[model samples]
Target: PPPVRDWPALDLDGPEFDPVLAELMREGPLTRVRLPHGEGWAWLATRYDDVKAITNDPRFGRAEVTQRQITRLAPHFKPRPGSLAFADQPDHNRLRRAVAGAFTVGATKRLRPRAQEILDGLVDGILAEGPPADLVERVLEPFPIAVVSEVMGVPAADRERVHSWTRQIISTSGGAEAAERAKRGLYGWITETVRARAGSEGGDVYSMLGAAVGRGEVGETEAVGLAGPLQIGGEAVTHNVGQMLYLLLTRRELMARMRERPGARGTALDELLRWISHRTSVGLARIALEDVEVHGTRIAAGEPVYVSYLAANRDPDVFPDPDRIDLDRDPNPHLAYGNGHHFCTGAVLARMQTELLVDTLLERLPGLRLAVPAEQVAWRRKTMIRGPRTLPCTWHHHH
Candidate 1:
C-alpha cells in the first residue's frame, strides 16, 4: 500500500501547487480515477464547464449507494434530514424551499447591519485583549457563529453548547462515531430550542421552521433535521473566515489595497475564497444513476463520484494563473458555494459576513500583521476540510 494514487492526487501545499488539478483541466474534460476512501474507482471532473454540467446533470446525485463503506471516509458521515449536503430531488427541494426566502439577496442585505455589528464587536474585543492574539479564537470563530445563532434565534444561554457541538461534529480527529454522537446531541439541542420558540412568537429562522412544523409542512423530527446543515454551514463560513484572515495578514499589499477601496472587499473575498477555498475533501458525494461518460471516462451506474469543489475552483483552464489572487478577476465562477439545485442556501449570508468582517478588521486594526513567519504557522491536516489550526497576529492600537 504505497499510498493509493488511482484517483486525482491533489497536494494542497506541494511544490507545484494544484499541478494534478491543472493537468486534469488541461488534458481532457474528465478523468477516471480511484478515490482515496473507496474501493472502486470513479470520475474526477476538473474543467469548469464539465464540472458544472455534471453538477447540474440530473443523472448525478448526492445519495450514497454504499453508506456503510463511505462512513470510513469521514467522522461526520450521516444521512440526517435537512442535510442539503447529502440530499437529492424531492426531499432536497422540500428542505430548500423551507429556507429559500432566508437566502435571497434582499434578505442578506438586511443581515449586513447585524453582520457589521458582529465584526466590530469581535475586532474591538481582539484589540482589547492586547497584541499577538489568536485571531481564529477572538474574531473569526465568534462572528459567524454569533450571526448564525442570531439568524436561527438560538438563545444566548445555549450558544456555547451549540457552538461546541458544531465544532465536534466537524472535527476530523473525532471520527465517524464521535461525529454521529455529536450530530444527535446537536439535533436534540435544536429540538429543545425549537420547542421553546414554538410556544413563543419570534421573528427568526427557528421560529419560521417551528411555524412550518406546527403547520404540518414539516414534522417535528424533520424540524430537528435543519440543525445539521445549519450548524455545518455556520461552522464552514467561520473556519474559512479565519483562513482568509491569514491570507490578508501575510499579503499586506492586498490588505492595504482593500482598505483604500471599500468596494474591493467583495472582489477580494471572492478571490480569497477561490484562492484559498477551504475544505480539501469533496463537499458532496454524488452517485451515477445510469451509465454515463464524463471527461471522456465512462462512469458505471451506482459508482460514487465526488465533486471536488476546491480542484474545480482552481482549474487553470478556467482561471488563468489560478494560483495568483486576482482581486479584480471578472467572470469569477468559483464554486466555493457550489452550484445547481443544491447550491448553498446561505451563500449570500456567508458573502456578506465575509465582506463585513474584512471591512471591520481593516478599519479597526490598521497595523494587523502575522505575529510569526508563514512557515512557522500551523495548518490543519484534516482531509475533509481545510483551515489553519491557529492564526497568531499582532495589532497596534492608537488608544
Candidate 2:
C-alpha cells in the first residue's frame, strides 16, 4: 500500500505558489494523493516528462473519469457526463472540431486588431478615471470579459450580465447555492443564444456551434456543454494576466528590464506565463486504461492519475534554474496552457490579450505601479483560479 497525502485547500496569499506542491515534487515524481473532495486516492505525477507523457498518451483518458467519483480539488467540479472535457480521443477531436474555426491561429490573428483597439479604450478609461484605481476591476477583469465576449459572439449589451454570472459561478466566496444558480443561468443563456444563430455562418464561436447544430454534427446539449466551458475557460485570462502583472509589480528589476527593452516583451510574456503560479491545484484527472509503470509504481487499469502542470513547469530537469525567471530562456515549452489534444482552445487569444495588456500598460502608463505594499495586495481564496482580488495601482501623468 502506498502512502496518500490528504491535500487540504490552503488559502494562500498573492502568488505564494503552493509550497505543499513544491514539497511533493521533492518527495518523488509519483505519489498517491487524496484531494479535498471526491472518493478514493489518485496517483499524482510531478515531473515534466511524466506529465507530458500522461497527457499525450491515450492509455490515460478522460472518458473513464466521467463514470467514476474520483478524488478532485474542487467539490463543485463534477464531471459532466457528456462534456467535451470528459470526452476521450477521437470523440474529443470531433467535439472540438465543431467550433474549431473560431479559435484557429488565423482567426485569432484576425481578432488581434479589434482586441488591441478594445484594450486601448480600456487603458484610456483607466487614464480618465485617474490613479488609486483597482487594476483588477479597471483593466484585468473587464478586458478579458469584453474580448472573450467578442470571440464568443456575446453582444456588448449582454457582456456585463454574462460576466456577472461568470463571477458568481467561478467565485467560491459567493456560496454554493449562488454559484449553482449562476451556472444554470449562464448555461440557459448559452443554449438560447446559440440556438438563435442556428445555420448562420459567422466567424465567432456561437455561430460555428450553431452551424454545427444545423449540420447535425452534435446535439444542442453537447453543443451547449462545449460552449459553456469555452465561455468560462476564456475568462481565465483575467486571473492569469493578473498573476503576471502582480509578479512584475512586486519585482521592480523585472519591470525595469521590460520597460528598457520593448522588443523583448513577447518573449518576456511567455517567460512570465511560464513562471507565474496561476492555478491553486491540479486540474481534471485522467483514468488509466491499463496497467502501466510510471517511474517505479505500477498504476493499475481504471486508477485515476492527476498530472501537476505547476510542478512540471518547475521541474529542475526541464528548467535549469526552475525558480529563477529567465526572460531569455529560448525554447521554453511550459505546460501553462496545458498540452496535447485537451490543450486550451483560447491559448492564442490569451497570449494576444496578455501581450497587448503588458505592452500597452507599460508603454502608456510609464509610471504604472502598485499603490499599496506588496503584502497589502488582496488575493482570491477558495477559488481554483489564483490571482489578486484587487490590484490597487497608481500611475504618473505628464502633460
Candidate 3:
C-alpha cells in the first residue's frame, strides 16, 4: 500500500490550510487517503463538480460496502437494512417513496410557524435569565433537539438518553466497546419507542412508519431501520446550528449586515455552511459498483470512496475566494446537505430551524455579542462534528 496521509493529523487552523485543501482538489477528483484508525486507504473525492456528479450518480452506493468493511471503517457503523441513506436501487426508491409524502415543501411550510414559536419561546427564556449565557446550551442546542423529537414523536423526557446515544454513535474516538454499548442502547430505546407508538396509535415519524408497516408498504423491522439515520440527521442539524451562530457572533459585521437586509440571511447561511464546513475529515463513504473516472483519477470497481463535501464546498473553481463569506454570493452552489438521491431528507427542517433562529435573534436582540473572547472559546477536537463546545453571549432584551 502507498503512504496514505492520516486525515486526523491535519491542522485545520493552519495558515496553509485552505491552500493545501485547494491543492488536493486540483490534484484529481479522487485521491487515496488513510483513516486515523489504520483501516487502510480510502479514496478522497475533492472537486466540487465531481463530488456533486458522483454523489448523484447511482453507480456508487453505500450498499456495495460489506458489513465487515463498514465495521472496520467506524465501530459504530451499523448496517440498517431499509435505511434510506444506505439503500440502493429498487429498495431505495421504495423506502424513499413511503416517507417522501411527509417531507414535501408544503409539509415543511406548515412547520415554519411552529418552528418560529419554538424559537420565540427559547429567546424569551434566554432574556429572562439575563446576559452572559451559553447560547448553545440555552438556545442553539436544545431548539433542534426539541423540534426533531416532536416531529419524530420521541418524548421530551427521553431526549437526554437520545442525545447521549447520538453523541456516542457519532464520536470517532470511542473504542469498540463504547460504540457497541451506545448502539445497543439506542436500538433498544428505538425499539421500545416504535412499539409504544404502534400500540397507542400515536403520531409523528415513528407512528407514520408504523402506519406504513400496517399498510404493507414497509415491514415493522424495516421501519425500525430508519430510526438511526433520522436521529443522526436531526442531531447534525442542531450541532451545525450551534456552530453557525458561533461564527455569526464572532463576525459582528456580518451579523449586522444580515440584520439590515433580511434577504441576505439565505446567502449568509450558505456561505457560513461553506466556510465553517462541519463534519471534519471523515466524509460520506461509498463503494463503486463499476470502474469510473472522476476528475483525472480512475476509480476501480469494488473500491471504497469518500466524498469530502466540506472540501468540495471550498473548491475555488466553483466558489470564488471560497475562504471569505460573501453575503451576496449568487449561484452559491454548496453541497451542505449533500447531493443526488441520498441528499439529506431533513434539509427543509434544518433550514427552517437555522433561519428561524437567526431571524429571531437579530429581531429580538440587536445588541447581542460574544460574552467571552474568541480565543477563550473551546472547540471539540478530533471529532467528526466540529464546533465550539460553548458559546458565551451577552445581549440586551427588549421584553
Candidate 4:
C-alpha cells in the first residue's frame, strides 16, 4: 500500500475499538491507517496474528527514524534514542540487558513491598480524607510517582517538583513549549539524580545504572541518557490505574464477585490488565524495509507500520471470549505487556503494583463503587493518553 488520502483517520476512542479499526480488521489484519493526529500514515496490523508477526521484526525498523520525514500532530512525540521503545535491535538489547538484572522477576518481588508501602499510605490518606473524594487526585496519580521516585532514590524534597515536571511531560493538551520546558525539568532532575547516585551505594534502579557506568560496562554518556527518559508519569502506571479502577467500578457484577471471593484476586486483576483501555494510540512505529504480504494485504516498501496492542489483546482467535471480562480466563496469553524484544521492562513490577492496589480496592472498600453513574464519570482524552481525570468514589455510608 502506497501513501493515499483514501485512508481513514484512526479512531482510538469508543468502548471497544473505534468503528474505523473494526472495518479495517474485517478487511484484513494489515491495513494502512492515517495514524491519528498526523503522526504520519502507517500500515496498522490489527489482529492477534498480524500484530504478533510484525512486532520486533527487523524487516520493519525504528532505527532510521531521523532520516525520514515524520509528520507529528504534537511536538513532544519526536523520537528520542533515550526511550527503549524506540531502540532498534542492537541498542534495544544492550539497554535491555543493562537494566534486565534490576527488572527481573526476583527483582520485582523484592520491590513488591515498596509498591505495597506506597499504596498503603495513599489508601490510608484517602481513608483519612473521607468519602466522595477524588481517588485520582489522592491516589491514582501520585502512587506511580511515589513508586518510581522511591525506586530511583529521588529525595523526599525533590519528589513534588519532579512529579510536577513528569505530569507536564506527558500532557498532550499542553502545547509543545510547555512539554519542551518539562523535558528540561524532568531530565535535569534525572541528570542530577544520576550524578548524585554515582557517589552512593544502594539498590535503587538509578543507582544500578550509575553502578554500571561506574564499572565501565555502560558508556558514561549513555548512562546519563538512560537515566533521563524514564522518570515517568506518562502512561506506564498512572493511566492504567485509572482505567483499571474505571473498568472494575463500571462492572457492578464483577466488582461484587471480586469483593466476595478474595481468593479470585489474582485472576481478576489479570483480566483487568487485559481489559483495561490501552495506554495510547501507538506503541513504537517502524519503517517497512521491503515489500511484505500480511494476511493477504500488500504492504509496500519504505512505508511505516504500527501495532495496536489493544486490538491484538482482544482478538477472538486467541482469547475465547475476547469481549467478556472473565475473571478466571485460564491460559490468557494476552499481549497487555506486548511481545518480543520490545516487551515492557517493568512488566513484573507493574503487575505487583496493580495486584496490590486492586486487591486493596476490592477488599477494603466493601461499599466501594462510583460516586456518579458510570456514564457520568469524568474522563480526559488526549493524543498520548486517556483516563478518568477524577475518579470520584464513595463507599459504605461515609464509614
Candidate 5:
C-alpha cells in the first residue's frame, strides 16, 4: 500500500497555486491523501483525464458517502441525509430537473439586466465613497448575495437573514456550534420559502422547486435539500470573484491588456477561472460501488475517492504550459465549475457575474489597484472556500 499524504489546509496567500497539491500531481496520477478532518484517508486523482472520468462514472457514487465517515475537509459538515448533493442516480437527475429552468441560458440572461442593476448600485456606492475601499466589503460580498437572491427569488426583506446565515455556514472560523445553528436556520428558512412558493407559475428558482413539489415531482424534504445546496453554492461566487479580482489587480500587464480590448474579458475570465486556485482542498468525496482500475492501481469497492479539480485544471497533458495564463487558449475544457452529472448548476450565472464585474471594474476604474502590498491583503483561514478576507483597494477618483 502507498503512504498516505497528510494534506493540511495550507493558508495559501493570494492566488498562488498550492505547492503541496502540485507536488502530489508530480508524484503520480493517483495518490492516497488524508485531509484535516474526517475518518480515513482516500484516493486522490490528480490527472485531468482521471478526475474527469471518476466524476462522470456512475460506478463511483455519492449516495454511499453517507454510509461512511470518509476523510473530508470541513470539521463541521456531516453528510446530510437526502441532500441532493449526495443523492445518486434517478433521484439526483430528478432533483436537478426540478429547478433546471431558472439556470438555463435564457433564464440567466433574462436576469442579466437585473443583475447589472444590482451591481451598478453597489458600484455607484463605491464610486461615491471615493478612492480607498475594501472591495470585499463594499462590492464583492454584497454583489453575489444580492444577485443569488435574485436568482433564487428570495424576497428583499429576507436577504439580510439569508446573507448572515450563509456567512456563518461557509466560514469555519465560526466553529461547529455556530455553523450548525446557521445550517438549521438556513435550511428551515429555505423549507418555508419553498413551501410558500408552491403552485406558483413564477420563473425564479424557489418557485420552480415549489412548483415541482405541487406537481408531485419532489417531496418537501427533497425540495429543501435541493434548494439548500443551490443557495449556499451560488454565494460561492463571492470567494471566486474576489480571487479573480485580486489576480487582476496584482498583474498590471494583464489588467492593462483587458482594458485595451473590452472583448477579451469573456475569454480572459475563462482563462483566469482555469488558473485561479480558489478552494482549500478537494470537495465531497465519492464512494466506489464496484472495484475500479485507475492507472495501474486497483481501487477496491467501497473505498472513498477524492478528486482535485484544482489539480486537474493544472494538469500538463490537457493544458499545455498550464502554469501560464493564456487568454487566447482555445478548447479550454477546465473543470473549475466541474464536469458531468454533479457539475455546478450556476455556471452561466457565475460566468455572467464574473464578466460583469471584470468589465465594470476595468472600465469604470482604469486606475484600480491594490491599496496595500499584495502580501498585506488578508486571506480566509480554516474555510473550505478560499479567497481574500478583506481586499483593501484604491482607484483613481473620477470627477
Candidate 6:
C-alpha cells in the first residue's frame, strides 16, 4: 500500500485543503494507498476525471464485498440486500428502479414550495424563541427529518419520535450496539409505516414504495429499508446542511453576497458543495468487479479502491484556483454528488433545502453571528461524517 500516509482525505481536522491529501493528489491520478479503515492496500484516486471514471464504471463494485470489514471504522456493520447505500448494480439498479418513482424530479419540485413553508415555520420557532439560539437544534437538524417524514407519511404526532430514532441510530455516544438497537427500532417503525401505506390511497413517496411492495416489485423490508435513510436521516442533507452552514458562517461575506444577489445564490451553493470536505472521504469503498485500468495501473478483481471526492473536487486541473470558493465558477463540473449510476438521487432535494436554509437564515435573522468563536464551534470529532454538532448563533432579538 504505497507507504502509509498521514491520514485519509476524510480526516476532519486542520484546513479542508489538507496538505497530506494535496500531497497525495499531486502524486498522480491513482496512487496505491491505505486508509485507517481500509481492509488492506487500496487505490486512492484523486484526479477528477479518474475519480469520475471510478464512480461511473461498473468494474468498480460496491457490492459483493467478501470482507465483513467493508467500511473503515465499523467492521460489523453489514448491509442487507435492500440497503441502498451499500449495494451494487443489478442489485442497486433493482433497488433504484423500485424506489425511483417516489423521488422523481417532479416530486422534489412539488416538495420545494412546501419545504419553503417548513423553513419559515422552523425559522418562526427559532425567531419566536429569541436570539442566542442553537439554530441547529432549533432549525437545521429537524428539517430533513420533517421533510422526509412528510414524504414517508409519518404522522405529525410520531414525527419527533421518529426524529429521536434517527438521532439514536446515527448516534456515536450510544456505542455501535446502541446504534444497532436504534436501527431495529427505526426499522420496526418503518415497517409499521410501510404496512399502513401499503393499501392506502397515498400521494407520498413512502406510499409509492409501499405500492411497489404490494406490486411485488420489492419486498416489504426492501421498501422500508430504501425509504429509511431518506426519511430517517440521509447523509447528504444531514451532514452537508450543518457543514455548509458552518462554512457560510465562517465566511460571512459569502452569506452576505448570497443575501444581496439572488441569482448568485445557486452559484454560492455549488461552490460550497465543491469546496467543503463533507466526509473524511467518499462514504463507501469500491471493489474491482473485474480487472480495470486506472491511470495506467491495473486493478485486479476483488481489489478495493477509494476515491477522494473531496480531493477530486479540488483538483487544480479542473478548477482554476480550486482552493478558493468562487460563486461565479463556471465549468464547475464537480462530482460532489458523485458521477454516474451511483450519483446521489437526492441532489435536487439537498440543493433546494440548503438554499432555502441559507436564504431564510439570512432573511429572517437580522445580524446573525456566531455566539462562539469559529474555532470553538463544537464539532463531532471521531465520527465518519464530520460537522459541527452545535452551531450557536445570535441575532437582534427585540425582546
TM-scores for every candidate against the unseen true structure:
0.87, 0.96, 0.87, 0.89, 0.96, 0.92
lDDT of 5 by residue, 1-399 (tens): 678999998786778888899889988888999999888899999988899999999899998887778888876566664476798989888888888788889988998899888889998888888888998888888888788888888887788899888886443365667877987898898888888878897888898888888888887777666787778775578889898888778888787777877875667778888998878888889988899999777899999999889999988888999999877688788999988798888889888888787788777775888999999987887777789887888888757
Q: Per-residue alpha-carbon lDDT of model 2 for 106-214, expressed as tens digits? A: 8889999999999899888879877778878888888887888888899877887898987773534757788888888888898888788888988878888888887
Better of 3 and 4 by TM-score: 4
Model 6 C-alpha RMSD to native: 2.4
- RMSD vs true structure, all candidates: 3.4, 1.6, 3.3, 2.8, 1.6, 2.4
lDDT of 6: 0.73
1-399 per-residue lDDT for model 6 (tens digits): 255453543444323655667788877777766555646666788888888888888677776663446436434555655777777767778777765655677877888889899889988887887787887777777887777777667777787787887886353355767777877887888777777667656667667677767777777767555777676555457667778777777887776776788655777778888887776544677888878888877778877788888998888889988888877789688888887787887777777778788877888888888888888765565566667777889989875
lDDT minimum window of 10 residues, candidate 4? 5-14
Best of the two (1, 6) by lDDT: 6
Using lDDT as the measure, what is the rank order of every candidate, best first? 5, 2, 6, 3, 1, 4
In angstroms, give how far residue 266 of model 5 lies from its true place: 2.5
lDDT of 2 at 329: 87
Give the winner by lDDT: 4 or 6: 6
Query: Any runs in candidate 3 off by more than 4 Å, and if so which?
Result: 1-3, 9-23, 68-75, 155-186, 196-203, 397-399
- What are the per-residue Cα lDDT tens digits for candidate 1 across 291-363? 8877667778886666667777877778898778868888788998888887878888888887777777777
- RMSD from true fold, candidate 5: 1.6
User: Alpha-carbon error at 119 in model 4, in Å?
Assistant: 1.3
TM-score-better candidate, 3 vs 6: 6
lDDT of 4 by residue, 1-399 (tens): 433323433344323455555566666667666544555566778788778878857687776654565433233345554557667767777776666676678877888887888788888877776777777777777887787677666777888887887777343355657877887777766665665556457667677777766776555656545655556732466667777777767867876777777755777777777776555456556777888777787777887777778778778888877778877888677788888787777788677777777777666666887887766764555555656667789987442
- Candidate 2: the clashing residue pairs are none
Write out the backbone clash pairs for model 1: 29-295, 30-295, 75-175, 75-176, 279-386
Off by over 4 Å in 1: 1-28, 64-72, 169-182, 196-203
The candidate with the higher lDDT, 1 or 2, is 2
**What lDDT is reached at residue 281 by model 5?**
87
The weakest ten consecutive residues by lDDT in model 3 span 9-18
TM-score of 2: 0.96
Q: Which ten residues in a row have the lowest lDDT in candidate 2?
A: 73-82
